[PDB]
Amino acid sequence: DRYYRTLYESLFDPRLVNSSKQGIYLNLLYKSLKQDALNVERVEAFVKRILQVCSHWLNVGTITGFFFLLIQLAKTVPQIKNLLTNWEINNFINHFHPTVKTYANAYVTGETEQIAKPDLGLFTLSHFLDRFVYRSAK
RNA sequence: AAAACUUUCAACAACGGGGUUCUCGCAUCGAUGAAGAACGCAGCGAAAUGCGAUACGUAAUGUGAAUUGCAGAAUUCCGUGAAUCAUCGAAUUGCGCCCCUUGGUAUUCCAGGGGGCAUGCCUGUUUGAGCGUCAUUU
């Protein structure tokens, strides 16, 4: 209980937004939530707070990561989908990044087959510039 | 089990770096403590009061046994004498003398109360003294 309490707290840590190691945090969150499938209320509370934190981030790769995780956590814990029928997702459906929008749409629609696991180092700004200047060359 | 490492930016954090002398002008002094300084002062004090390095003060005059929160001196006390005492004209708390009036066993001794008296010098009033000089039978 104390570990999940500290994780639910650290989700609101402001320094997390500018942390290079957000991928490790993503993997840790996925593993923790997967291991807690029995506590439906607790995992739903983490899902809600995860979206809360995501709404105010600038790193695209992390946001795509959370959406992919939520999609996968939905498979192990289908009761998470009840929240969509029983509000934040509307913003991500209207996110500026097309990839984030598609991931959100897939999570809402449940259409998971067209999602590759998002990879950090992709969607980052330098990579976008490398595409956008039209000269990558491997 | 995807991070570390080097380099360059960028933040953020450490680290880091009154006197003295000269010149110029202005003219306004008080024995009643100016302007300026500051320990804050008392044996141990915060305010109040008192004071000025002579600092809860020094001198002089008076009174007469205290001060007081603590400590400590004592006052040879029958008085040259404490007092955060008084007055105040300039620890010396220096050095004194005597008169008047009442009582307590009172001729001794004691206790109160009152009043003067420092010294020098000038003038005058009063009182004496000198083997200093002298008159003294109308």
Side-chain angles (χ1 to χ4, degrees), chain A residues 60 63-64 67 92-93 95-105:
Chain A
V60 171
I63 296 159
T64 46
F67 268 107
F92 299 98
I93 292 159
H95 204 245
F96 72 95
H97 204 274
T99 317
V100 173
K101 175 163 185 136
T102 49
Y103 275 53
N105 283 352

Side-chain angles (χ1 to χ4, degrees), chain A residues 1-136:
Chain A
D1 271 7
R2 199 167 186 266
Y3 165 64
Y4 284 111
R5 183 176 84 180
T6 57
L7 185 63
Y8 204 46
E9 195 173 318
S10 75
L11 272 171
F12 281 151
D13 194 316
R15 302 162 295 182
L16 175 63
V17 186
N18 307 353
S19 171
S20 51
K21 299 182 187 193
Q22 281 149 348
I24 306 177
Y25 191 78
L26 277 167
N27 281 292
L28 175 64
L29 290 157
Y30 177 60
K31 189 160 182 182
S32 309
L33 297 172
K34 184 188 173 197
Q35 289 166 337
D36 203 40
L38 275 288
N39 293 268
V40 189
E41 296 211 330
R42 176 153 67 189
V43 177
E44 289 173 352
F46 290 105
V47 169
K48 184 77 163 164
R49 188 170 285 183
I50 282 159
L51 290 170
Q52 289 167 356
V53 172
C54 288
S55 296
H56 303 88
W57 283 22
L58 210 63
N59 189 334
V60 171
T62 59
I63 296 159
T64 46
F66 293 106
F67 268 107
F68 179 80
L69 289 192
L70 293 172
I71 291 154
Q72 293 286 2
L73 294 174
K75 299 186 189 180
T76 64
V77 187
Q79 298 320 79
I80 294 163
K81 195 101 174 151
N82 192 1
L83 282 71
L84 296 166
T85 51
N86 191 0
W87 271 324
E88 285 166 324
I89 187 55
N90 197 21
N91 307 150
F92 299 98
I93 292 159
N94 299 291
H95 204 245
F96 72 95
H97 204 274
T99 317
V100 173
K101 175 163 185 136
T102 49
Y103 275 53
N105 283 352
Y107 175 82
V108 172
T109 60
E111 190 275 329
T112 183
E113 62 269 18
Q114 288 170 14
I115 297 169
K117 180 173 182 181
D119 46 333
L120 298 174
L122 188 70
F123 316 137
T124 185
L125 190 138
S126 178
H127 186 273
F128 171 87
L129 300 175
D130 206 358
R131 290 194 181 284
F132 191 63
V133 70
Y134 294 153
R135 298 185 296 280
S136 50

